[PDB]
Design a protein around this ligand. Structure first.
Ligand code: MG
Ligand code: ZN
Ligand code: ZN
Ligand code: ZN
Ligand code: ZN
Lengths: 49, 528, 98, 73, 46, 40, 490, 117, 275, 67
C-alpha cells in the first residue's frame, strides 16, 4: 500500500459506473447527475480545463 | 512589511485614512416609483427603523418626543435611545418602565427616521458631483429604495437590479448644508456643460409626444381625471378647444396647465419632420411639427427630446432659469403624473407587428441587395484583370477594400432609408424612435431591413484560417458574405456564418466595455 | 496527502516549487441549477497576466467555429478569457505514436 | 479605574452585564447603562475580508504555527 | 427524556439519551437525524 | 443493410439527422472530455 | 485517410493534415486537441445513406450504435488544424445546389449548424433573432436561474441551495434541449406576459407583476442553508462540547436566547428560528484551573463559542444530522428551509437576457384583462425591446402562443426553413387571434379598453438567486475594528 | 419580512378614521373628500355618479400612491348647492340603482330555469 | 335622483359552472366595479390555518400547507352565518367563526398512494365539504374526481395534520376567489373608437360582433356612449355562479351603505358645511 | 414536482384534471383534443397542464421507504 488516489465521480474506477438507473436511485444518488468531478473533504471539486 | 501596509489600495493613506468605511449607512436594490417627487426617496420600514437621528429636546417639542419615548422601540415611529446631558446613554428596550424615565430640556433623543429627514443617496462608482445628492425619505412597504424615475439619468441607474448607497447625516449643521447645497432641485442644471442634467425619459417621454399631437381630444370626464393628479392647479378648468357638438380639450391645451405660466421658449422643434432647412419657409403652412411656447402655453407642435429633454435650451432648462428650482421641481413631478395617467387610458406597446413590413418593400430591398452584390462581383472582376487603377492616396489592396466598403455601406443605407419610409404612422417602433425615447434609425434598419457588414478593429472579418474566414468558404473569397456581411435581418433570422460573424462584432463591444471602466477610473483620479 | 492537498486548495505543485503558475485550476462544483453544474463541467480556461492585459487573446478568433461556444463568457473581468466547449466538441485523450 | 473587568455600573452594583453584539454596546439589564469599550470578539476583525481576492490570502498577518504542540513560536 | 436519533437507513430509533457513541446498534450506518419535535408549529396556508 | 448498388434514393430528409445527433449524445457522455482523460 | 476510416489507426486520437504549398505532412497523436464530428462527403454526395438511419432507429432493440456509425467511416473527427484544410459544406441542400453554385469540391459536411453552440447558448430560443451581446448576457443569467438542480436534493446538504416549487418545461423548445435533460429538470416558468407601458411602474428594466399569481404559488420557491459545526479536542487542554449553555457555568453571555436548544446542544427539526436564535450550543473548556484560587463563582471553567443566526430573518429548521467527520470527531449539519415569495426587488429574466427587477405587484383585479379575462402575470416595458433588439423575445412569445392553443410544444431551433414570421402568424390567425399577437386589452381601474392593442402571450421566465432580502443592509454604530477602530466590512 | 400583513390592505386601524372632510381655499363652494383604506373599486364608481349629476361643476378622484391605501375625491358644485349633499345623493341613488339591478337579476334568474338551485 | 338609469339585465346561459349575461342601460364604472367585486369582494370559506403533526412525504411542510389552502370549499351554506375571525368574541378560533378539517393517511400497501380531498374530512357537519364527490356522483364522470393530488406517499411514509377554514375575500389572498375567471366586454363593434385599429380587416370578429354579419367592419357613431355590457362569469366550483353575483351585488351594497353611515356620522356632530 | 392546484394566471382549478389527462394520452393520441375533452378551453390553462413536468416520480423512486 503506497497511497490514496482521489476518484473522479462515475469514471471507470468510481463504483457507480456499473449500475443502472434503479440501482443508483436505490443508492440515493441521482441518475441524472453528470459526474466527472472529484469529491474532497465533503466538497465536490471540479477541475477547469 | 510596514511599507507595503502603508502603500496604495488598502494602504494606510489611500485605502483607509483618505477613504474609511462609515457608520449610518444603508444599501439596497432600487425600483422605479412615479409617485414620488424628484427629490424624494422611498425607504423600507426595516431600514428606517434601524437607523437613527439625534434630536435634542427643546421646551416646545418635548411633549411629542416624550410620546416618542413612550412608543418605545417595538413599534415603528419610536425612539432607540435617550442621552442625558450628564453624558449617559440609555437604551429604550431593556428599561421596564420608560414612563418612569422623565425627559427634560438638554437630553438628546435618538429617534427612528421619519417621513421628511434628509439623506445623501449615492451610486458608486461616483463619476461626477451629481452622482451623489440629498433627498427627502418617504417610508413605505417592501424592501428597496424607491426613487422617481427621472433621477435615473444623473445616476445612470437602470432598475435592472442596480444597487444604491444611502447615508444619513446626524447634526443640524450637516442637515442644513445638505439641504441647501446637495439637494436634487439644486442639482438640475449641470455646471459641467451648462445643460439640464435630467430630462423626461422612457414612457413619459414617449407618452408625451403622443399626447401633444393635435389629433388627441378628451371628453369632460377624462379632463377632470388628469386635472385631479396635477398639484399646482389653480382651480379653474380651462375653456375647451371645442365647444360643440360636444365639449373637448386638446392635448396641447391640458399640457399648458402643467408648465409654469411664464416660460417663453421659442424654437426647439427639431424632430425629423417638417423639413431640413427651408421647406416650411416655402410659404409657411404654419408647422404641424415646430413647437412654440408663449405666456406659459403650448401653442403649436408636439414634444420630444429636442423640446422636453436634457438639451440645453429645453422647457425644463428655460423654466429652471426663469421660475427657479422649486417651481421646476413641482413641474417635473406634475408632468410625469398627468402624462403617466393619460398613458394609462391610451397604452403603449411593441409586438412583432411593428417590425414586419409589406411584400413590395421586401422585393425592393432584395432587389437592392442583388444590385450591390452584383457590383461587388463587378469590382472583383475589374480587380483580377489588373485594371482597377489605384486611388492617388492608397495601394491597390486598400483601394479595393475602401471601394467595396463604400458600396456595401451604401447598400445598407439605401435599404435602411427605404424601410423607414415604407413604415406607417401607427408603428409603435416609430413612436419610440421619434420621441427620442430609445433606439435609433439604424436600429429600425437592423430589425426589418438588413444588418450589414460586421466589423473588427476597423476592418472586415480577418482571415483567421489561411486565406479564409471560416472553413465553409472557398479560398480567397473577397465577396460580401465570406468577409462577414450579414444579408438578412433580425426579423428574418441570420444564417450560420452571419450568426458567427455577428458574434465576432458583438464581442468587440464586450472587451471595450470591460477595459474602459479601468482607464477612465484611473485618468479621472490623476486629475482630481 | 500531496494530491488531496492540491485538489482541495486549488494551489499547484507540492508548495515548494511555487503555486502561482496554476492558480484556480481546481474549483468547488457550482450547482445552482442543473444547467449550471453541466456548464461548469464544460468550462475551459485561458491563462493571462492578471489585471488588464488587452490584446488579441481575448476576442473571438475564427478557429473557434465548432470547438468553443461563440457566445458564452463572463460579463466582466475575464470577458473572453473564460471559454466553453460547444456541444459536439471533443478533446483527444492522446495515444502512443508507435 | 483599574477595577472593571465588567463591574463598572455607577448607579448600582452589577450582577451581570449583557453584550448587544448588533449595537456594538455594553448594556446593563436593570437600568439603562452603556459603557461601550466594544470588544466584538476583536478576533473577528482580521476575518472580516472574504469577497476580495484571497485563497492564497495576501492580507494575512499571522500564521497559526500550531502553538499547542510547541514551546516556541 | 430520550432524544430518539432516527438512524441512517433503517430508521429504528436510538434512544440516545446519554453521552454514548452515536452509532446505531444493529445497523452499520452512523449518520443520524434528530426527528421532528412533538412540539406543534402553525402554518398559515397563505 | 446497405449495398450501394440497388440503392436509387440516397437522399434523406436532414430533419432525420437528429437521429444521428442523438446517437452521438446517447453514446458519448455529455461530458466525456473530463471522464476520458481521467480514465486515460 | 483510408486506414483511419478503416479503424487501423485510432480515429479520435489521430489527426492528419497535408499543407501542400509547403510540401509537408504533419500528423498528431498528442492529447489536448479539440476536435468535432463531421460527415464525410464523397463524389459530391453524402457517404451516409438512409439505410444507416433505419439501422439507427432499429437500436430500440438493436446493439447498433454511434461507434458502429464511425466504423462505417461515414463520420470522422476533425481537429482545428485539420479544419483549416477541409472544404466544409453548410448543409446537404447547398451540396445539391452546387450545380449552379460556385463550389463543387466539398469534403465534409456539417451534421447541423446549431451545434456550434455551447450548453447555455443552447437553452435559449431563436438566438439568431437576438442582437449578439444578448446571447452572452443570457448564458450568464442562465447559471443564475434557480430550479430543481438535481433530483435527490432532499438528501443533499449543499451549503446553500435554491429550489423552485413548480418548474415547467419550456413551452417553446430548442431541439438541443432534448439532450440537456432540461425537460426533465427545468429552470423557470411559462408565464403570461404583456409588453405594455401600464401605470409605468415598470420603466427602465423592471416589471409589473400579478399578485394573485405569486399567491397561487407562481414562482414561489424554497431556500435551504446548511450550517455545520464541529466539536474538536484540538489541543492538550482544550475541549469543545455540544451542550445547553447556561449563564451559570458558560462564558459567552451573548444575549441571544439559548432556550430553544435541546438538552443535547442543538435544536430539533421543525422549530422556528429567527435573527437571534441559537441553532447549536458549543462550548470551549479552556484554562481549566490556570486562574488559581477561587476564580470559580460562575462563567469560569469554559468559554462559549456556539453558532447562532446573524445571517437573516430566516425560516424553519428542516433537518439536523449528527454524525462523525473524517477526523473521527462528533460533527453536525443543520439545514434551515425558507420560502421565498417573489416580491418587489427580486430579479427575473426571460431567456433573451431581458433580466429585470420587479417594480410593483397588482392583484388580479387591477391587471389589464382580455376578452376571456387572462390577466398578465408580468408586464415588461416596451422600451426594453428597441435599443436592445431582442426580437427573438417577440418570436419566442408568438411561437409560444401557437403552442398553447395547438397544445403542441413548438420549436425554436435557431437554423431551419420554417420561415418563422409568415408561417407562425398564419397559424396563429387560423386559431382565431390577431395573426401577429396583439389582443384588445381593457383597463383594470376604469374598465375602458386600452386604445392601442397589447402584444400579449406566453414566455418562459427565470427567477434568479439574487433575492432582494439577501442584499438589503444597514448600520448604526455596531462593531468596531480595534486594530483600526472603524466599522466592519458589511 | 418587511412586507405588511395582507389584511392591512383594507382593515381600518383603531386610531385611524374612515372619512375626513376638508374645504378648499382656491375656489368657492368646493370640497375635498378623503376616504381611508379603500381602492379604485369604490372611488371610480362614485366619481362617475357625481359626474352624471348636472349640478356638479367638477368631480374627480385619485389614489396618491398604490402602496398606501387611501383615495381622495375632489368635488365642486354651483354656489347654491353644497358638494356634501351631491355626494350624499350620488351614493343613495347608486345604492338604489344597484338594488334595482339586484331585484331585476333575481327575477331574470327565476324565469325559466329549474337549475337555479 | 333624476339621473339614475333603469339598469336592466338579461340572462343568456346558465349551467353548473357558467353564467352568461348582458347588463344594459348602466354605466361603465358600474360594470367595471361589479366585475372587480366578483374577483375581490365576494366572501367565501377556504382553508387558512394548518398545523402539521407528522409529515414524511417527499414534499416539504409549507408546500403541503400551500396546496391545502388553494382547494375550493363548497360554501353553498350561507357564509354569513360564519363571522370573520377578527370580530368574534372567542379566543383564536371557534365553531362559530371556523370550520375544522382533519387529515390522517399512511401508505401500508406496496403500491403508490394518492392523497386527495375525499380523505380530507370536515369535523364540522356535512354542509361545508371539499368540492370533490359530495352533492353528486355526477353523470359527467371526472374518472377519479380526485379534486387534487395533495401529495404522494410510499410504504412507510405518513401524513397527519389539522386545518381550520375561515371566511375571507379575494382582495386579501387569491385562495379566497369565487371565480375561476370572468369575461367582460362592451361595444364589440368598436362603434365608439375606444380602441383604434390599424388595418381593421385583420381582426377576428367577436362572438357578439355578429349583429353586423357585414364584413364592412365597425360602423362609426360619434354621439354614442357605453351601453350593453357582456359578462361571462365562471365559477371555480366553490359556489354556484348566480349565487356569487347576487352575493357580490349585496356585499357591495353593504359596503356603500357603510360609507353612508360613516358619512352621516361625520355630520351627526358638527354640520361640516353639509349645506 | 406535482401539479399546481388552480392555474397561476386565471384561477381555474387544475389538479382535478391531471391524472385524467395522463390516462387519456396513454389511451388516445390527440393531445390537442385531449386537452379539449378535459375542458381547459383557454390557453393559459392549456400551458399549465400542457407544459408541466411530473418530477415527484423520480423522488418517490428513491430508496427512502424510510424517509
Ligand atoms: Mg445600469
Ligand atoms: Zn445597572
Ligand atoms: Zn440502523
Ligand atoms: Zn369565534
Ligand atoms: Zn388559466
Amino acid at each position: 500500500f503506497i497511497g490514496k488516489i482521489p476518484i473522479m465521480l462515475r469514471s471507470t474506477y468510481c463504483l457507480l459506473n456499473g449500475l443502472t438507473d434503479r440501482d443508483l436511485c436505490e443508492l440515493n444518488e441521482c441518475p441524472l447527475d453528470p459526474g466527472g468531478y472529484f469529491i474532497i473533504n465533503g466538497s465536490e471539486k471540479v477541475l477547469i480545463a | 512589511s510596514l511599507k507595503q501596509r502603508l502603500k496604495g489600495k488598502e494602504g494606510r493613506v489611500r485605502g483607509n485614512l483618505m477613504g474609511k468605511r462609515v457608520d449610518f449607512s444603508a444599501r439596497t436594490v432600487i425600483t422605479p416609483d412615479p409617485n414620488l417627487s424628484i427629490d424624494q426617496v422611498g425607504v423600507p420600514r426595516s431600514i428606517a427603523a434601524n437607523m437613527t437621528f439625534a434630536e435634542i429636546v427643546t421646551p416646545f417639542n418635548i411633549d411629542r418626543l416624550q410620546e416618542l419615548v413612550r412608543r418605545g422601540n417595538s413599534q415603528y415611529p419610536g425612539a432607540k435611545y435617550i442621552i442625558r446631558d450628564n453624558g449617559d446613554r440609555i437604551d429604550l428596550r431593556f428599561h421596564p418602565k420608560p414612563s418612569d424615565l422623565h425627559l427634560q430640556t438638554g437630553y438628546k433623543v435618538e429617534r427612528h427616521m421619519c417621513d421628511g429627514d434628509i439623506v445623501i443617496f449615492n451610486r458608486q462608482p461616483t463619476l461626477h458631483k451629481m452622482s451623489m445628492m440629498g433627498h427627502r425619505v418617504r417610508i413605505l412597504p417592501w424592501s428597496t429604495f424607491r426613487l422617481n424615475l427621472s433621477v435615473t439619468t444623473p445616476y445612470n441607474a437602470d432598475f435592472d437590479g442596480d444597487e444604491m448607497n444611502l447615508h444619513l447625516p446626524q447634526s443640524l449643521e450637516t442637515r442644513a448644508e445638505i439641504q441647501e447645497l446637495a439637494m436634487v432641485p439644486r442639482m438640475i442644471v449641470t455646471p459641467q456643460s451648462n445643460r439640464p442634467v435630467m430630462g423626461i425619459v422612457q414612457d413619459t417621454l414617449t407618452a408625451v409626444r403622443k399626447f401633444t399631437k393635435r389629433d388627441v381630444f378628451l371628453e369632460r370626464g377624462e379632463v377632470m381625471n388628469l386635472l385631479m393628479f396635477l398639484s399646482t392647479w389653480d382651480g379653474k378648468v380651462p375653456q375647451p378647444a371645442i365647444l360643440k357638438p360636444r365639449p373637448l380639450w386638446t392635448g396641447k391645451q391640458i399640457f399648458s396647465l402643467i408648465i409654469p405660466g411664464h416660460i417663453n421658449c421659442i424654437r426647439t422643434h427639431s424632430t425629423h419632420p417638417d423639413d431640413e432647412d427651408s421647406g416650411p419657409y416655402k410659404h409657411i403652412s404654419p408647422g404641424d411639427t415646430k413647437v412654440v411656447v408663449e405666456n406659459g402655453e403650448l401653442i403649436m407642435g408636439i414634444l420630444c427630446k429636442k423640446s422636453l429633454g436634457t438639451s440645453a435650451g429645453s422647457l425644463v432648462h428655460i423654466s429652471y432659469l426663469e421660475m427657479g428650482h422649486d417651481i421646476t421641481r413641482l413641474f417635473y413631478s406634475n408632468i410625469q403624473t398627468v402624462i403617466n395617467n393619460w398613458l394609462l387610458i391610451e397604452g403603449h406597446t411593441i409586438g412583432i407587428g411593428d417590425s414586419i413590413a409589406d411584400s413590395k418593400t421586401y422585393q425592393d430591398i432584395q432587389n437592392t441587395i442583388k444590385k450591390a452584390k452584383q457590383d461587388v462581383i463587378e469590382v472583383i472582376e475589374k480587380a483580377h484583370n489588373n485594371e482597377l487603377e489605384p486611388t492617388p492616396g492608397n495601394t491597390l489592396r486598400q483601394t479595393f477594400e475602401n471601394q467595396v466598403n463604400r458600396i456595401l455601406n451604401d447598400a445598407r443605407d439605401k435599404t435602411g432609408s427605404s424601410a423607414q419610409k415604407s413604415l406607417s404612422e401607427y408603428n409603435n417602433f416609430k413612436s419610440m424612435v421619434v420621441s427620442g425615447a430609445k433606439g435609433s434609425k439604424i436600429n429600425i434598419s437592423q430589425v426589418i431591413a438588413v444588418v450589414g457588414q460586421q466589423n473588427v478593429e476597423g476592418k472586415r472579418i480577418p482571415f483567421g484560417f489561411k486565406h479564409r474566414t471560416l472553413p465553409h468558404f472557398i479560398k480567397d473569397d473577397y465577396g460580401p458574405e465570406s468577409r462577414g456581411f450579414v444579408e438578412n435581418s433580425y426579423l428574418a433570422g441570420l444564417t450560420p456564418t452571419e450568426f458567427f460573424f455577428h458574434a465576432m462584432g458583438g464581442r468587440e463591444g464586450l472587451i471595450d466595455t470591460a477595459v474602459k471602466t479601468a482607464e477612465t477610473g484611473y485618468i479621472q483620479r490623476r486629475l482630481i | 496527502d500531496g494530491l488531496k492537498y492540491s485538489l482541495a486548495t486549488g494551489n499547484w505543485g507540492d508548495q515548494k516549487k511555487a503555486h502561482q503558475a496554476r492558480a484556480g485550476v481546481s474549483q468547488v462544483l457550482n450547482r445552482l441549477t442543473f444547467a449550471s453544474t453541466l456548464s461548469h463541467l464544460r468550462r475551459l480556461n485561458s491563462p493571462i497576466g492578471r489585471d488588464g492585459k488587452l490584446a488579441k487573446p481575448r476576442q473571438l478568433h475564427n478557429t473557434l467555429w465548432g470547438m468553443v461556444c461563440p457566445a458564452e463568457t463572463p460579463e466582466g473581468h475575464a470577458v473572453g478569457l473564460v471559454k466553453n466547449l460547444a456541444l459536439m466538441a471533443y478533446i483527444s485523450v492522446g495515444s502512443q505514436p508507435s | 479605574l483599574d477595577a472593571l473587568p465588567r463591574v463598572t455600573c455607577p448607579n448600582h452594583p452589577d450582577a451581570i452585564l449583557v453584550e448587544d453584539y448588533r449595537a456594538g454596546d455594553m448594556i446593563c439589564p436593570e437600568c439603562g447603562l452603556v459603557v461601550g469599550d466594544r470588544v466584538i470578539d476583536v478576533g473577528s476583525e482580521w476575518r472580516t475580508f472574504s469577497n476580495d481576492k484571497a485563497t492564497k490570502d495576501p492580507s494575512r498577518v499571522g500564521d497559526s504555527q500550531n502553538p499547542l504542540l510547541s514551546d516556541g513560536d | 427524556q430520550p432524544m430518539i436519533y432516527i438512524c441512517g437507513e433503517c430508521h429504528t430509533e436510538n434512544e440516545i439519551k446519554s453521552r454514548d457513541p452515536i452509532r446505531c446498534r444493529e445497523c452499520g450506518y452512523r449518520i443520524m437525524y434528530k426527528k421532528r419535535t412533538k412540539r406543534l408549529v402553525v402554518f398559515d396556508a397563505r | 443493410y446497405d449495398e450501394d448498388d440497388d440503392e436509387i434514393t440516397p437522399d434523406l430528409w436532414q430533419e432525420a439527422c437528429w437521429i444521428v445527433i442523438s446517437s452521438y449524445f446517447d453514446e458519448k457522455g455529455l461530458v466525456r472530455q473530463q471522464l476520458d482523460s481521467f480514465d486515460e | 485517410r483510408k486506414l483511419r476510416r478503416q479503424m487501423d489507426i485510432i480515429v479520435s486520437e489521430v489527426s492528419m493534415i497535408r499543407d501542400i504549398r509547403e510540401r509537408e505532412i504533419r500528423i498528431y497523436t498528442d492529447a489536448g486537441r479539440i476536435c468535432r464530428p463531421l460527415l464525410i462527403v464523397e463524389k459530391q454526395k453524402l457517404l451516409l445513406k438512409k439505410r444507416h438511419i433505419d439501422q439507427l432507429k432499429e437500436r430500440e432493440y438493436n446493439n447498433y450504435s454511434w461507434q458502429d456509425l464511425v466504423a462505417s467511416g461515414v463520420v470522422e473527427y476533425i481537429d482545428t488544424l485539420e479544419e483549416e484544410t477541409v472544404m466544409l459544406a453548410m448543409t446537404p441542400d447547398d451540396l445539391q445546389e452546387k450545380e449552379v453554385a460556385y463550389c463543387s469540391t466539398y469534403t465534409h459536411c456539417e451534421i447541423h449548424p446549431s451545434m456550434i453552440l455551447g450548453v447555455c447558448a443552447s437553452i435559449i430560443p431563436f438566438p439568431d433573432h437576438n442582437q449578439s451581446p444578448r446571447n452572452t448576457y443570457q448564458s450568464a443569467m442562465g447559471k443564475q436561474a434557480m430550479g430543481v438542480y438535481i433530483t435527490n436534493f432532499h438528501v443533499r446538504m449543499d451549503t446553500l441551495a435554491h429550489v423552485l416549487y413548480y418548474p415547467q418545461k419550456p413551452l417553446v423548445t430548442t431541439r438541443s434541449m432534448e439532450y440537456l435533460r432540461f425537460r426533465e429538470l427545468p429552470a423557470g416558468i411559462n408565464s403570461i406576459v404583456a409588453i405594455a407601458s401600464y401605470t409605468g411602474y415598470n420603466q427602465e428594466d423592471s416589471v409589473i407583476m400579478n399578485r394573485s399569481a405569486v399567491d397561487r404559488g407562481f414562482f414561489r420557491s424554497v431556500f435551504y442553508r446548511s450550517y455545520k459545526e464541529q466539536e474538536s479536542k484540538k489541543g492538550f487542554d482544550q475541549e469543545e462540547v455540544f451542550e445547553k449553555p447556561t449563564r451559570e457555568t458558560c462564558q459567552g453571555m451573548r444575549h441571544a436566547i439559548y432556550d430553544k436548544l435541546d438538552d443535547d446542544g442543538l435544536i430539533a427539526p421543525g422549530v422556528r428560528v429567527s435573527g437571534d436564535d441559537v441553532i447549536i450550543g458549543k462550548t470551549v473548556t479552556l484554562p481549566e484551573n490556570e486562574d488559581e484560587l477561587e476564580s470559580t463563582n460562575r462563567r469560569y471553567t469554559k468559554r462559549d463559542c456556539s453558532t447562532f443566526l446573524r445571517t437573516s430573518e430566516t425560516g424553519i429548521v428542516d433537518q439536523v444530522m449528527v454524525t462523525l467527520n473524517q477526523e473521527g470527531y462528533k460533527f453536525c449539519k443543520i439545514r434551515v428551509r425558507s420560502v421565498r415569495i417573489p416580491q418587489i426587488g427580486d430579479k427575473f429574466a426571460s431567456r433573451h437576457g431581458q433580466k429585470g427587477t420587479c417594480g410593483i405587484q397588482y392583484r388580479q383585479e387591477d391587471m389589464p384583462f382580455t376578452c376571456e379575462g387572462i390577466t398578465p402575470d408580468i408586464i415588461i416595458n416596451p422600451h426594453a425591446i428597441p435599443s436592445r433588439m431582442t426580437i427573438g423575445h417577440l418570436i419566442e412569445c408568438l411561437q409560444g402562443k401557437v403552442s398553447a392553443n395547438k397544445g403542441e410544444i413548438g420549436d425554436a431551433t435557431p437554423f431551419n426553413d420554417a420561415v418563422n414570421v409568415q408561417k407562425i402568424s398564419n397559424l396563429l390567425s387560423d386559431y382565431g387571434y390577431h395573426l401577429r399577437g396583439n389582443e384588445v386589452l381593457y383597463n383594470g381601474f376604469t374598465g375602458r379598453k386600452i386604445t392601442s392593442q397589447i402584444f400579449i402571450g406566453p414566455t418562459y421566465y427565470q427567477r434568479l438567486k439574487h433575492m432582494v432580502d439577501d442584499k438589503i443592509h444597514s448600520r448604526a454604530r455596531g462593531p468596531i475594528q480595534i486594530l483600526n477602530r472603524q466599522p466592519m466590512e458589511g | 419580512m418587511n412586507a405588511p400583513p395582507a389584511f392591512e390592505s383594507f382593515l381600518l386601524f383603531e386610531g385611524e378614521k374612515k372619512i375626513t372632510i376638508n374645504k378648499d381655499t382656491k375656489v368657492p363652494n368646493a370640497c375635498l373628500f378623503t376616504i381611508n383604506k379603500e381602492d379604485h373599486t369604490l372611488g371610480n364608481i362614485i366619481k362617475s355618479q357625481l359626474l352624471k349629476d348636472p349640478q356638479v361643476l367638477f368631480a374627480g378622484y385619485k389614489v396618491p400612491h398604490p402602496l398606501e391605501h387611501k383615495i381622495i375625491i375632489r368635488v365642486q358644485t354651483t354656489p347654491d348647492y353644497s358638494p356634501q349633499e351631491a355626494f350624499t345623493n350620488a351614493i343613495t341613488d347608486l345604492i338604489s340603482e344597484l338594488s334595482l339591478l339586484e331585484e331585476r337579476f333575481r327575477v331574470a334568474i327565476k324565469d325559466k330555469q329549474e337549475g337555479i338551485e | 335622483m333624476p339621473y339614475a338609469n333603469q339598469p336592466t339585465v338579461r340572462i343568456t346561459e346558465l349551467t353548473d359552472e357558467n353564467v352568461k349575461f348582458i347588463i344594459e342601460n348602466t354605466d361603465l364604472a358600474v360594470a367595471n366595479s361589479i366585475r372587480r367585486v366578483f374577483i375581490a369582494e365576494v366572501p367565501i370559506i377556504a382553508i387558512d390555518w394548518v398545523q402539521i403533526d407528522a409529515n414524511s412525504s417527499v414534499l416539504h411542510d409549507e408546500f403541503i400547507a400551500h396546496r391545502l389552502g388553494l382547494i375550493p370549499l363548497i360554501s353553498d351554506d350561507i357564509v354569513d352565518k360564519l363571522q370573520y375571525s377578527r370580530d368574534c368574541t372567542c379566543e383564536e378560533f371557534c365553531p362559530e367563526c371556523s370550520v375544522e378539517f382533519t387529515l390522517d393517511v399512511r401508505c401500508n400497501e406496496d403500491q403508490t398512494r394518492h392523497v386527495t380531498s375525499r380523505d380530507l374530512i370536515s369535523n364540522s357537519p356535512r354542509v361545508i365539504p371539499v368540492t370533490s364527490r359530495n352533492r353528486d356522483n355526477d353523470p359527467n364522470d371526472y374518472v377519479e374526481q380526485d379534486d387534487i393530488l395533495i401529495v404522494k406517499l410510499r410504504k412507510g411514509q405518513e401524513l397527519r395534520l389539522r386545518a381550520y377554514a375561515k371566511k375571507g375575500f379575494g382582495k386579501e389572498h387569491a385562495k379566497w376567489n369565487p371565480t375561476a375567471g370572468v369575461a367582460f366586454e362592451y361595444d364589440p363593434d368598436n362603434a365608439l373608437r375606444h380602441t383604434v385599429y390599424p388595418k381593421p380587416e385583420e381582426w377576428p370578429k367577436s362572438e357578439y360582433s355578429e349583429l353586423d354579419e357585414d364584413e364592412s367592419q365597425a360602423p362609426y357613431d360619434p354621439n354614442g356612449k357605453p351601453e350593453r355590457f357582456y359578462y361571462n362569469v365562471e365559477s371555480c366550483g366553490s359556489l354556484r355562479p348566480e349565487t356569487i353575483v347576487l352575493s357580490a351585488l349585496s356585499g357591495l351594497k353593504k359596503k356603500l351603505s357603510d360609507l353612508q353611515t360613516q358619512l352621516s356620522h361625520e355630520i351627526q356632530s358638527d354640520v361640516l358645511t353639509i349645506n | 414536482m406535482i401539479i399546481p392546484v388552480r392555474c397561476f394566471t386565471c384561477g381555474k382549478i387544475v389538479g382535478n384534471k391531471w391524472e385524467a389527462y395522463l390516462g387519456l394520452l396513454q389511451a388516445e393520441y390527440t393531445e390537442g383534443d385531449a386537452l379539449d375533452a378535459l375542458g381547459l378551453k383557454r390557453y393559459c390553462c392549456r400551458r399549465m397542464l400542457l407544459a408541466h413536468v411530473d418530477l415527484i416520480e423520480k423522488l418517490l423512486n428513491y430508496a427512502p421507504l424510510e424517509k
